[PDB]
Design a binder for this molecule. Structure first.
Ligand code: O9L
Ligand code: O9L
Lengths: 351, 351
């Protein structure tokens, strides 16, 4: 159903299932359609809902009729203030496309960082704390369902510049990780790719996401990627140039069925001397606890939220630089705290 | 067959079909096996052939029994001094892997450029001429067969630093283009991706490779990528920021069935002000003739070989900076010249 309204604007009307809530298809109309993204899957559009005037992002992906879509399945489960909301899904055009209608968010962490980096400046630490904290919250939430994003990178961190609200997006790499069931090794954007994946692990856990979050924190502190690999395995060289050569124990912790990379012995660089001189030590300390070789040695998302780097966010007096209140930071559900309930005492300040 | 030699070394023995020459499988033994690369396809190994002591790269790709492998088919046709030679292929271990045994080449153009850029210098122009000339030769060769590489980027330009010999590698994206038969639009590493592909063209030609080669030339002159997109469509913004907004004629030349990107009108940037002040004009001029929006307006690889930027390579007196002779540059076959035979009078100096 494509029509023209009062003036002469192109209105598209589709039958779409609500993203969350009852499985009751309804007519949804939108206009002002334009391409804002693309990839192996297909295209991302900006559009405006006719009823409410609200901007949405529509991800359009080729669908194997017989094959069930993993991304749709995951997006239908999720309901969290730091994950972009699936509003609706619908099918369109001898092949069929799934269309995911999402809340539109006008910026990304990547673009905000590039603005600073292109001017050889760094993001003020308060922005770093707000973004990194909300990402760790989204990760606690999805990891509590056994769901691993597997593509944490600055481009998939949407933000409202005015409220400083962050939304995790692009669940196209996401998977429910099940003990015993192998996972693909070539996964995640290279710079953010956990060392176990480079060692070809198929038995990895949700902790590959914490490594990625570590790479994002480090990038925001440095003003450039901490591990800029030219390839999958040169990525490992770059990591070793900072963390040093991993021990046989660490390598076994990463992939117990690995083959020979036979790279030379390099000593670790001191963490503090990786970052610029005035970098806050609590920031550097959090980085060291995220970017551990041994996956089980990495802080959990909930633990990362409790780190002293975020202490400033739990100040009753804290405000955004633009003067407005901080967004919702402390309204933790049961599900969010499920990994370690007692952490609440730290994660929820007195008043 | 995995065995131990005179000393106690791990020798692997496989039955492999010669890359070129008769379909006659023979025993091939190799040792000193190590991972040098990986990707969606699988893993790349270094190994040493036991008989000859020669270093090879072994690309190992998962093989669908029912599907015939496009990459193998193409590699078996190719025999050129600037394309990495398929020596052998063999199958290994309930799933089956194709192993492509290739000549080992110890550097890439990308790594050589990074060495200079990381020191805030540029590659001397003579290296730029040598690399770009050999790339255009490999492209003239494969394009003469209707074969398009579709992943031209500095990482896929292997070189022997001593002889300055360049070998095109990674034919994992390569395809014989047939008029009428659609090709995938999401293809090529983003920075090198021709504008028609971003407009979602499925009837592009081998000229997408010349656009990529232009992006490589520009990067070698600049010390960084000329079009650093954060995404598929932001790639187009970055291009427009230099070339300006394309005309409706150029857009139609790129994809006659395209959709709304609805981007702002931006005026072209002067070519000479993109590059550093002492950039040779013949280099900038060649770049302008490669990075044309209208695909048919792009120089052919053979035409690009005949450009005045390469005049220095046809000097009887020219030598490598290390003092050694220039490699074979002028031993063009008939097949190579097939796109425009008369260009020989320029391409093959009397000496
Ligand atoms: C590629 C693969 N998988 C998902 C996505 C995607 N999901 C969203 C949700 C919401 C979005 N809202 C806005 C937006 N833009 C405008 C702001 S700058 C990035 C593009 N982009 C969005 C987006 O992109 C993209
Ligand atoms: C990815 C996808 N498809 C193919 C390839 C590939 N083919 C070759 C051939 C020969 C090679 N020789 C050497 C080499 N190294 C050592 C030098 S630095 C890059 C890795 N790498 C090679 C290579 O990689 C990689």
């Amino acid at each position: 159903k494509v029509s023209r309204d009062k003036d002469g604007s192109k209105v598209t009307t589709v039958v779409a299932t609500p993203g969350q809530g009852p499985d009751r298809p309804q007519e949804v109309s939108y206009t002002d359609t334009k391409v804002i993204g693309n990839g192996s899957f297909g295209v991302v559009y900006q559009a405006k809902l006719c009823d409410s005037g609200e901007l949405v992002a529509i991800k359009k992906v080729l669908q194997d009729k017989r094959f069930k879509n993993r991304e749709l399945q995951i997006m239908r489960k999720l309901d969290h203030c730091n994950i972009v909301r699936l509003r609706y899904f619908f099918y369109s055009s001898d092949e069929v496309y799934l269309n995911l209608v999402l809340d539109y968010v006008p910026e990304t962490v990547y673009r905000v960082a590039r603005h600073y980096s292109r001017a050889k400046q760094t993001l003020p630490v308060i922005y770093v704390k707000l973004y990194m904290y909300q990402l760790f919250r989204s990760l606690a939430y999805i990891h509590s369902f056994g769901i691993c994003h597997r593509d944490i990178k600055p481009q998939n961190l949407l933000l409202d510049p005015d409220t400083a609200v962050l939304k995790l997006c692009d669940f196209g790499s996401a998977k429910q990780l099940v003990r015993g069931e192998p996972n693909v090794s070539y996964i995640c954007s290279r710079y953010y790719r956990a060392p176990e994946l480079i060692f070809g692990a198929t038995d990895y856990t949700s902790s590959i996401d914490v490594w990625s979050a570590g790479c994002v924190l480090a990038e925001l502190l440095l003003g450039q990627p901490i591990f800029p690999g030219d390839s999958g395995v040169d990525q490992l060289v770059e990591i070793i140039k900072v963390l040093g050569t991993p021990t046989r124990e660490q390598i076994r912790e990463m992939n117990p069925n690995y083959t020979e990379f036979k790279f030379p012995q390099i000593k670790a660089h001191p963490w503090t001397k990786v970052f610029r001189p005035r970098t806050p030590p609590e920031a550097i300390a959090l980085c060291s606890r995220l970017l551990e070789y041994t996956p089980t040695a990495r802080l959990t998302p909930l633990e990362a939220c409790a780190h002293s780097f975020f202490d400033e966010l739990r100040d009753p007096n804290v405000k955004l630089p633009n003067g407005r209140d901080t967004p919702a930071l402390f309204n933790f559900t049961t599900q969010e705290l499920s990994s370690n309930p007692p952490l609440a005492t730290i994660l929820i300040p007195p008043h």
